[PDB]
Every structure is written in structure tokens, then in C-alpha cells.
UniProtKB/Swiss-Prot annotation:
Signal peptide: none
Protein name, per record: Bromodomain-containing protein 4
Record gene name: BRD4
Consequence of changing residue 112 to G: Found in a patient with a neurodevelopmental syndrome; uncertain significance
Portion of the parent chain present: 42 to 166 of 1362
Domain Bromo: 25-131
Comment field (misc): JQ1, a thieno-triazolo-1,4-diazepine derivative, and I-BET, a benzodiazepine derivative, have been tested on tumors with success. Treatment with GSK1210151A (I-BET151, a I-BET derivative) has strong effets on mixed lineage leukemia and promotes myeloid differentiation and leukemia stem-cell depletion.
Length: 133
């Protein structure tokens, strides 16, 4: 008997940052989402939990990917913007929304991590209220 001692928690593969067969465009709004919106969120004091795919192994959250089936994070978003992955700003905004919503689903109001997400979301909403064009 192995007693399943070899079955260890692993992370799923991260979201794709490149898809040659996905149509893409460079728009002023997408340029702005990278240069302004993401870059200022990235420098925020609370950005660090969000700067890379959730590492459920390192953080000892083996339940995370049982609960969260559409993971998203700002490292993935940053790479998608730098790689010209998106067709339009709304596709990128959707990824930001997923990242925030995942945090509120997995956690509970009043948790430090939720306060962090809430603060980043408020800045995000302020920055995207006016896009170019
Ligand atoms: O997910 C992360 C941190 C979550 C978290 C949860 C509760 C807190 O109070 C603070 C941070 C995280 C942090 C660093 C990293 O390299 C990979 C990660 O996945
Ligand atoms: Na661990
Ligand atoms: Na793009
Ligand atoms: Na703006």
C-alpha cells in the first residue's frame, strides 16, 4: 500500500498568455490599459497577491482550485497585454473582473485579502472610468 503519500497538491497550468490563432488588435484603449491602468495597479502596496497565478501549493490552499474554476491574475493580464493577446479593451477588463470576483468568492468580507482586492478594484474603476477615444 502506498497510502496515497505520493499524491500531492499541484497547481493547474496557468492561463494562456499567447494564442496565435486568436484574433488580436492594438487599440489605444488596450495600450492605455497596459501603460496606465495595469502599471499603476502593479505598483500598489496591495498588488502582490495578484501579480501571478495563485500558487495553491505555496500558499497551502489545496481547496483554491476546487472552488475557483476560472483563475485570473495581473501577471497573466500583463503578459496578455504585452503579447498583444486581446482584441479589445472589454476582453481585458473581463479578465480584471474575473480576478477580483475570484477573490471575493474564495474569501469572505473582512479578510485582509478581500480588503486588498477591494482597494485595487476601487483604483481600477477610477482608472477605467475614462479610456482613450
Ligand atoms: O495568493 C497569494 C497570496 C494570497 C493571500 C491570501 C491572504 C492574505 O491575507 C494575503 C495574501 C500569493 C502570493 C504570492 C505568490 O507568489 C503567489 C500567490 O498565490
Ligand atoms: Na505548501
Ligand atoms: Na491586445
Ligand atoms: Na482613465
Amino acid at each position: 500500500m502506498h497510502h496515497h503519500h505520493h499524491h500531492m497538491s499541484t497547481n493547474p497550468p496557468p492561463p494562456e498568455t499567447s494564442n496565435p490563432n486568436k484574433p488580436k488588435r492594438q487599440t489605444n484603449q488596450l495600450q492605455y490599459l497596459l501603460r496606465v491602468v495595469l502599471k499603476t495597479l502593479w505598483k500598489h502596496q496591495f498588488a502582490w497577491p495578484f501579480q501571478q497565478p495563485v500558487d495553491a501549493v505555496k500558499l497551502n490552499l489545496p481547496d483554491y482550485y476546487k472552488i475557483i474554476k476560472t483563475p485570473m491574475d495581473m501577471g497573466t493580464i500583463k503578459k496578455r497585454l504585452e503579447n498583444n493577446y486581446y482584441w479589445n479593451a472589454q476582453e481585458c477588463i473581463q479578465d480584471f473582473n474575473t480576478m477580483f470576483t475570484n477573490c471575493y468568492i474564495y474569501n469572505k468580507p473582512g479578510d485582509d485579502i478581500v480588503l486588498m482586492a477591494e482597494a485595487l478594484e476601487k483604483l481600477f474603476l477610477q482608472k477605467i472610468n475614462e479610456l482613450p477615444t
